[PDB]
Amino acid sequence: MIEQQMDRIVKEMRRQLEMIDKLTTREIEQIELLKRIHDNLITRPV
Amino acid sequence: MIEQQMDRIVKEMRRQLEMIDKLTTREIEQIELLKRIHDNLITR
């Protein structure tokens, strides 16, 4: 059929996409962390 | 058939690239935080 190779690749791009997805969750976590670090430098003026 | 399959590809190419606009948004959030932290460093 050659849709034989079309189906393997779909599946692929959705993997690529779900990794990106999860990678994004690691980008946002880094914010909650950068924010809690930009704030600790404020309370502790030293 | 083959044509039908290529669209899924197109939608997956848009739902992917779509995902990246979103990610580049976080990247910009971090950079502003970084700068906010650096200025709060010049002082102490």
Added chain:
Amino acid sequence: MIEQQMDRIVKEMRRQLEMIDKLTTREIEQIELLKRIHDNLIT
């Protein structure tokens, strides 16, 4: 309209790719401030 459906793919592989550029364009800004942030090693 199949060879033509690819003409959109090429349009978008190039669109996406031009967006993965900005994400990279930004990655460097972060890596820059971190350099300035580093320096106040003794201050």
Added chain:
Amino acid sequence: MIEQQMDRIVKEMRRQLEMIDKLTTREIEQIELLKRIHDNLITR
């Protein structure tokens, strides 16, 4: 053969994933280096 070029696409695609994997591995290392640093400043 055109069916054959496709194997170049699937391959090059797995060359993407095999990497987007390496990259996400780059990203977590940052989260752990930040969760740890925070906890450093947390004790002053």
Added chain:
Amino acid sequence: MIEQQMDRIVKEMRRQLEMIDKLTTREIEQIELLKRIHDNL
């Protein structure tokens, strides 16, 4: 240009394989600019 639109496509997969590859060399600069900050405690 089916078979010819084939390579133009495979091409962008190698040039896009470069963007991610580099975008990665930068991500590594961040992490060692961060460990070069964590241990700094």
